[PDB]
Amino acid sequence: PLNNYLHVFYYSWYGNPQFDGKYIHWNHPVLEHWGRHNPPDDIGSSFYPELGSYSSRDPSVIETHMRQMRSASIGVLALSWYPPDVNDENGEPTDNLVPTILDKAHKYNLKVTFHIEPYSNRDDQNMYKNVKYIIDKYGNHPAFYRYKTKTGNALPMFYVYDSYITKPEKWANLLTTSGSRSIRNSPYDGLFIALLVEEKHKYDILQSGFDGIYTYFATNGFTYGSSHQNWASLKLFCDKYNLIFIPSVGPGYIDTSIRPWNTQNTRNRINGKYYEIGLSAALQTRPSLISITSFNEWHEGTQIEKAVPKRTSNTVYLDYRPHKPGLYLELTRKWSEKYSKERATY
Numbered sequence: 001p002l003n004n005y006l007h008v009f010y011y012s013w014y015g016n017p018q019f020d021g022k023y024i025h026w027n028h029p030v031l032e033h034w035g036r037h038n039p040p041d042d043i044g045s046s047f048y049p050e051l052g053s054y055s056s057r058d059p060s061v062i063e064t065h066m067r068q069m070r071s072a073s074i075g076v077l078a079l080s081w082y083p084p085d086v087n088d089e090n091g092e093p094t095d096n097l098v099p100t101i102l103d104k105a106h107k108y109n110l111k112v113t114f115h116i117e118p119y120s121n122r123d124d125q126n127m128y129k130n131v132k133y134i135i136d137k138y139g140n141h142p143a144f145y146r147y148k149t150k151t152g153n154a155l156p157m158f159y160v161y162d163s164y165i166t167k168p169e170k171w172a173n174l175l176t177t178s179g180s181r182s183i184r185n186s187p188y189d190g191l192f193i194a195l196l197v198e199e200k201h202k203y204d205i206l207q208s209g210f211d212g213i214y215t216y217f218a219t220n221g222f223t224y225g226s227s228h229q230n231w232a233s234l235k236l237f238c239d240k241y242n243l244i245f246i247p248s249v250g251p252g253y254i255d256t257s258i259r260p261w262n263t264q265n266t267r268n269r270i271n272g273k274y275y276e277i278g279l280s281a282a283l284q285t286r287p288s289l290i291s292i293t294s295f296n297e298w299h300e301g302t303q304i305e306k307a308v309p310k311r312t313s314n315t316v317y318l319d320y321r322p323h324k325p326g327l328y329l330e331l332t333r334k335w336s337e338k339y340s341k342e343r344a345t346y
Contacts, residue, residue: 002075019055045298050306073336111145168207175209218250251275254301304328
């Protein structure tokens with residue numbers, strides 16, 4: 001059975017010459033601070049996908065991804081989303097793949113929710129527009145995710161990455177009752193999940209009107225929110241203030257193909273043990289949802305997607321030996337079933 005309460009962060013930003021006319025994302029630039037890879041032999045990842053330097057628009061890729069997520073008993077993909085009108089994307093807008101993704105998710109009884117990226121000049125005004133757009137265009141699709149609240153009401157969910165860039169007073173225009181562009185008590189109401197990075201964000205989130213928090217980062221120690229030391233405190237905080245706590249767990253982290261300096265935030269997978277430690281840490285908070293970073297953020301080495309050994313003449317790749325390419329899907333299934341069993345007792 002699928003765990004309806006387990007979400008994974010999904011990316012549809014990959015392109016290749018066969019499907020897109022060029023590489024997209026695999027030819028990721030090497031960043032200089034907070035010179036591009038040459039696919040297919042040299043991609044912007046420390047690992048190599050079983051599907052190769054694949055295209056996110058290739059229907060066989062999307063099919064395989066939905067099968068893998070069902071095999072992991074993940075019920076919901078949280079789709080990285082940019083509005084089409086921004087100049088944030090190097091191809092054709094990724095919003096034009098959302099219908100295919102919803103249809104493919106539905107084949108396997110998966111749901112799709114939205115991870116709103118930090119698009120150019122995102123604010124309260126264009127967030128109202130984009131929330132309305134997502135619910136109007138996608139909200140009637142049978143694979144469209146809603147979360148049933150304490151009061152019985154089922155609402156769309158929006159994860160807001162780097163929410164803190166926008167000041168609380170501006171969020172309150174959208175997220176509080178009497179705000180100038182309120183979605184509250186409207187057909188466009190939702191559960192808005194803030195990214196909690198720093199401990200001081202707790203108060204900002206309360207002033208903003210958010211409905212919950214998530215932590216995203218797969219590195220235990222990168223941020224206050226991402227640190228297992230703080231998850232009991234964040235759960236206490238969320239329970240006290242009627243917020244949905246969504247801890248984010250990853251299987252490892254390595255982004256040095258794109259951020260060569262960032263060795264401090266590398267986390268060895270310990271042949272699956274890092275992931276199992278983080279899953280244990282999340283489950284014992286008795287959270288309402290758990291998120292997994294990531295299905296396929298290959299740049300940052302957080303993926304649970306199948307990876308394979310690969311040798312080339314110029315690039316070195318990590319892999320999942322001495323285990324199989326599907327290790328992380330198998331570990332996810334084990335912990336998904338434990339979470340389903342324990343959550344039914346809360």
